[PDB]
């Protein structure tokens, strides 16, 4: 049972294809058109079905060229409004009919952020982008908004001729709009089945730069070059991904760098991964995110979770692949480093949520929880810890990598559950069931808190970050002078960031220490947002007022909820800055991403 979807479940019927014809109106801030769903009954004598919707307007529902009777249920808050459609012919099992839904999006769609020209880079054209994960696709078009159904789709999107529309699909040509010479219609096709949460759309003054045989980089003219360099490793990473996971089945793999208010590091949208511009560190140092989004092409996009409760299979396995790709590119020692660093985040997640919080479990029950509200790093890192502990328990990377490739092939184009994964794990490792039984499953999968056992991490690259953080934390006033820029001479960007995480964990520090740190290290001048984000969190935690404007600028100048949400939270927990924080949010709420707004509001306990 998928408790996040009011629509008919897979056992009743399935959506095999979507055909989407729509036009983007930037004045009305609406998407208008038709959605043609080829639905296949899964039982004998199916007379009606129910689709997900949210803030949608339905003009009519057509089947076999005649208007049929439909019904929009009463809103269930974040789940939307169920939509029951009365079929004109009762369907045998496996039969199909196409349902043409004529709809229109609301300007407040939880899935779409509209950007005024002012809000973009060029300053001369508006901009639009979607974010359907986890259950916002229902806010774009009617559907069975659940990962338990996988459809193919085709699309024709009318957009003002001077803009460009890209989708999570293969480009299939562009021609002027015959009903209107002010508009172009861009075509798309996605011949691989996907869950509707991977449907994605973008419209704006986008250009492209090619950085690989199957890889263009899209963004506004102001960042296309910055971005094509930052992500030059894409092709290298895609090959390594193909070696570990098997053939990349989606054809093209393009990258889109969105405006600052995009809420996440990246979205593994097929054929077109979205990423936050905060990755543009100028040294390729945050490129693991690309490797993460690349890896989703196997774990998540190909083998998908059946319900959102088993989401850890998506990110858990993906992260596992991400760090192997980095391990291939820079060395096993660097793989462990990121692995140990993930454990440190997992601690921050459990310490913040609390050792008993339901959302520190690996498999969660999202009945009556807003998925947007449950999202965290737990599935990513605790999910990784389980796989990394199995790799060591079953004979090492090489062995476990073999199971991963077998896992991905076994369940490709399908949607599975945690139990499906457990059974196959036992099956692949039948000659090691003794070793498998050794694992406290009920604790790993359904118990809160840190994992029962901590894997073994290589410390080689982490030692320097521990060494420097111990000096700073144990130093008295007569040690502050010896600190000096040379202390970092041999620290890489990733090491520089882990040192700040090492220190950030023992906050607050003496205000004198924080100042001496800015004085010797000049951390203010760094633009890598990961480093700068942790720096300003340390300052604000250590009650340095001077950081209050810096933290506010960063919390508002970009929208990545990884950075924005903590910064705002820390700022609201600092008495000197609480008022500004709550004032600034109010001032910005209307122009923030709909999901980011709601969540920052909940964090500040406002409205
Ligand atoms: C756009 O990003 C997304 C937003 C919503 C979701 C849904 C979803 C499901 C499970 C979890 C989970 C598993 S264990 C734990 N503690 N939480 C979290 C979120 C996924 C991605
Ligand atoms: Zn992910």
Describe this structure in words.
- It is classed as hydrolase.
- The entry lists the keywords Leukotriene A4 hydrolase, Aminipeptidase, Activator, hydrolase.
- This protein is α+β, with helices and mostly antiparallel strands and 607 residues long.
- It has 4 domains: 12-204, tricorn interacting facor f3 domain (Immunoglobulin-like), CATH 2.60.40.1730; 205-301, Zincin-like (2-Layer Sandwich); 302-459, Neutral Protease Domain 2 (Neutral Protease, domain 2, Orthogonal Bundle); 460-607, Serine Threonine Protein Phosphatase 5, Tetratricopeptide repeat (Alpha Horseshoe), CATH 1.25.40.
- Helix content is 35%, strand content 23%.
- The protein is built from 19 helices and 22 strands.
- The strands form 5 sheets. The chain has an 8-stranded mixed beta sheet, with no helix packed on it. A 5-stranded mixed beta sheet has the order 16-17-18-20-19, with helices on one face.
- The longest helix has 22 residues, at 332-353.
- The protein is globular and about 85 Å long.
- The two termini are 33 Å apart.
- Bound molecules: 4-{4-[(4-methoxyphenyl)methyl]phenyl}-1,3-thiazol-2-amine and zinc ion.
- Zinc ion binds at residues 268, 292, 296, 315, 318.
- 4-{4-[(4-methoxyphenyl)methyl]phenyl}-1,3-thiazol-2-amine is lined by residues 133-134, 308, 311-312, 359-360, 362, 364, 371-372, 374-376, 378-379.
Short characterization:
The PDB classes it as hydrolase. The protein has 607 residues and is of the alpha+beta class. Helix content is 35%, strand content 23%.
């Amino acid at each position: 049972v998928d408790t996040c979807s009011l629509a008919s479940p897979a056992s009743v019927c399935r959506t095999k294809h979507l055909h989407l014809r729509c036009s983007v109106d930037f004045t009305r801030r609406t998407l208008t058109g038709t959605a043609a769903l080829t639905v296949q009954s899964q039982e004998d004598n199916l007379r009606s079905l129910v689709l997900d919707t949210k803030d949608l307007t339905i003009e009519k529902v057509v089947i076999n060229g005649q208007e049929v009777k439909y019904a929009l249920g009463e809103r269930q808050s974040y789940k939307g409004s169920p939509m029951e459609i009365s079929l004109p012919i009762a369907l045998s099992k496996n039969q199909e009919i196409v349902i043409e839904i004529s709809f229109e999006t609301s300007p407040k769609s939880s899935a779409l952020q509209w950007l005024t020209p002012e809000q973009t880079s060029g300053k001369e054209h508006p901009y639009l982008f979607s974010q359907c994960q986890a259950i916002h696709c229902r806010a774009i078009l009617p559907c069975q908004d659940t990962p338990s159904v996988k459809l193919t789709y085709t699309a024709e999107v009318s957009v003002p001729k001077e803009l460009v529309a890209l989708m999570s699909a293969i480009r299939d040509g562009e021609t002027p709009d015959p009903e209107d010479p002010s508009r172009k219609i861009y075509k798309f096709i996605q011949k691989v089945p996907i869950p509707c949460y991977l449907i994605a759309l973008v419209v704006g003054a986008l250009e492209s730069r090619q950085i690989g045989p199957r890889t263009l980089v899209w963004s506004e003219k102001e960042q296309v070059e910055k971005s094509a360099y930052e992500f030059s490793e894409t092709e290298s990473m895609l090959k390594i991904a193909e070696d570990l996971g098997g053939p990349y089945v989606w054809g093209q793999y393009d990258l889109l760098v969105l405006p600052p208010s995009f809420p996440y590091g990246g979205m593994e949208n097929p054929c077109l991964t979205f990423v936050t511009p905060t990755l543009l560190a100028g040294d390729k140092s945050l490129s693991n995110v690309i490797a993460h989004e690349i890896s989703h092409s196997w774990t998540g996009n190909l083998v998908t979770n059946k319900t959102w409760d088993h989401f850890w299979l998506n990110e858990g396995h993906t992260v596992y692949l991400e760090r192997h790709i980095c391990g291939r590119l820079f060395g096993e020692k660097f793989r462990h480093f990121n692995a140990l660093g993930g454990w440190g985040e997992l601690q921050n997640s459990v310490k913040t949520f609390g050792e008993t919080h339901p959302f520190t479990k690996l498999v969660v029950d999202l009945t009556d929880i807003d998925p947007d509200v449950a999202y965290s790093s737990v599935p990513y890192e605790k999910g990784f810890a389980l796989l990394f502990y199995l790799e060591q328990l079953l004979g090492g990377p090489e062995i476990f990598l073999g199971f991963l490739k077998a896992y991905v092939e076994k369940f490709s184009y399908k949607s599975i559950t945690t139990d499906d994964w457990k059974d196959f794990l036992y099956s692949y490792f039948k000659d090691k069931v003794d070793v498998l039984n050794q694992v406290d499953w009920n604790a790993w999968l359904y118990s809160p808190g840190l994992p029962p056992i901590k894997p073994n991490y290589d410390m080689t690259l982490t030692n320097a970050c521990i060494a420097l953080s111990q000096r700073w934390i144990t130093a008295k006033e007569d040690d502050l002078n010896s600190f000096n820029a040379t202390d970092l001479k041999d620290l890489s960007s990733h090491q520089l960031n882990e040192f700040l995480a090492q220190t950030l964990q023992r906050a607050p520090l003496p205000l004198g220490h924080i100042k001496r740190m800015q004085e010797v290290y000049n951390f203010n001048a760094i633009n890598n947002s990961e480093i700068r984000f942790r720096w300003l969190r340390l300052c604000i935690q250590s009650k340095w007022e001077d950081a209050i404007p810096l933290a506010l600028k960063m919390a508002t100048e970009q929208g990545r909820m990884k950075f924005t949400r903590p910064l705002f939270k820390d700022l609201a927990a600092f008495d000197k800055s609480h008022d500004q924080a709550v004032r600034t949010y109010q001032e910005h709420k209307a122009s923030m991403h709909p999901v980011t707004a709601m969540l920052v509001g909940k964090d500040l306990k406002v409205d």
